[PDB]
Amino acid sequence: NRGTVDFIASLENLKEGDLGILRKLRGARLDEKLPGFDLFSALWWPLRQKNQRAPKREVAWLIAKLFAEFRFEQREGATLPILMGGICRKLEPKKELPRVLARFDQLASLDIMQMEEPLSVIMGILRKHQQVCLDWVGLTDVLSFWEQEPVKREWSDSFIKAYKI
């Protein structure tokens, strides 16, 4: 998973100009606004040459855009279901919890190509409670193998384990 680590580290090493370039391209394709294409090609291509493994292009593009919009310090041990469960536990158990849980459970139904806005609402709820960390490497690894059933099983189980305690 060293390629994912290098990808995330290169994402943190980015300056503010190309970060704004990526911020302006939210919800867009890869075939327009050439500076975004050039920046993404510079970010992703050296991973394949040295490292045999590399994250998928759609997953990498989604992660880069989400990082540009929702800049978070990468820290090991801060997976998205755990933080979501910790947020969900300190909620009203009658009305707000079913709504936020429905917004979370919408995520484990789509493909990579349609997860942008359902992930952006989650990151907005995270930013509302002033988070300072997110495991981008673990999220990228989970998003890579999103079609395997034990991956979704562990995602839901980690959410429930963090919610219950």
Partner: protein, 371 residues
Amino acid sequence: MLIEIHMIQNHSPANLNRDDLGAPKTCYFGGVLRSRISSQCIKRSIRTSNDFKALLGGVRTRRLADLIQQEAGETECWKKAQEILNKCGFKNKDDNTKMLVFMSKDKIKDLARIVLDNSLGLTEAAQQVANVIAQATLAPDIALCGRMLEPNDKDKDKKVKWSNTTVEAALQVAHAISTHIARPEIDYFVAADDVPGEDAGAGHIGESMFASACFYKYFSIDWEQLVKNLKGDTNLAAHTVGAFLLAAAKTNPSGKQNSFAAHNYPDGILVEFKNSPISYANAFVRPVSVVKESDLVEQSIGQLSNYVNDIRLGYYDEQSPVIGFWFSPNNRYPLGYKHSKLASRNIGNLNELVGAVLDYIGGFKWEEVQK
């Protein structure tokens, strides 16, 4: 001979069919979750449509004594009618019996005639009543949908043995599955108070559920069983077929349509004449994704055309060729830009499609058979 209709219809965001919890109906097809519309919903929405009003000659009711009184005018016979209805094994729970009864509306006058006169006795009249409900099958809707009625046995009169009270269905309607994945959505609604008060709160807060999808509809009609259901009335059977095609094309289920108004027309109709029924629902075992170079309806039509080509080439039989018509408004959507050969005739007008269907069916004209 069987007439099979396959339709592709993209819908605006709406909730045309929903379960007990309010969520839109879904199903698991091909290992993937798709949106569904129940077949009985489509059948009822076609049956109770304005374009089928000239053919509605049957009522499926629970209160028959009310109809008896309303068709007898002013002479009091409601308790008597309830009693004779109870005698033929129907029970009675506060003016409505325990079962629904399917019967043509023309025979209520006969039931009123038997219930009015005191010349006959009670129990024999009950037997007579059975002989009217077992023979009230000359309705287009009974002929299409089909009826089965099994009365009670713990309160029968022992002299009211029933004849055969079933009608085989002449129309098979499938559940309208979706061509792509399911995308359920929640609409968070509020309902405000017209009179200001102290707080800024509103009268009610809730959430509704809706989804937008492209549906694949499948219908099948058995012409021989249809003309047997109406006892050889080929003219009336052709009238039912034409009116059914018009109503099925030009009507949508009326579920939450005052808040969504998804009155969308089909974007493609394929009408085939066969001897054995085939369903093209396996065209979308792989769900339809979206490419920027096309749209959802065009991709769905292309997938349907590819699977139709596969089916025709893999199950060709020289003994039974199949003749089909493809309809799209003003030929907006052809049967894929790859073959141009699965459609025997390309039609751009719905009325011309109905006329060609009727002419293939029996050589009749539409305006002849409309009355």
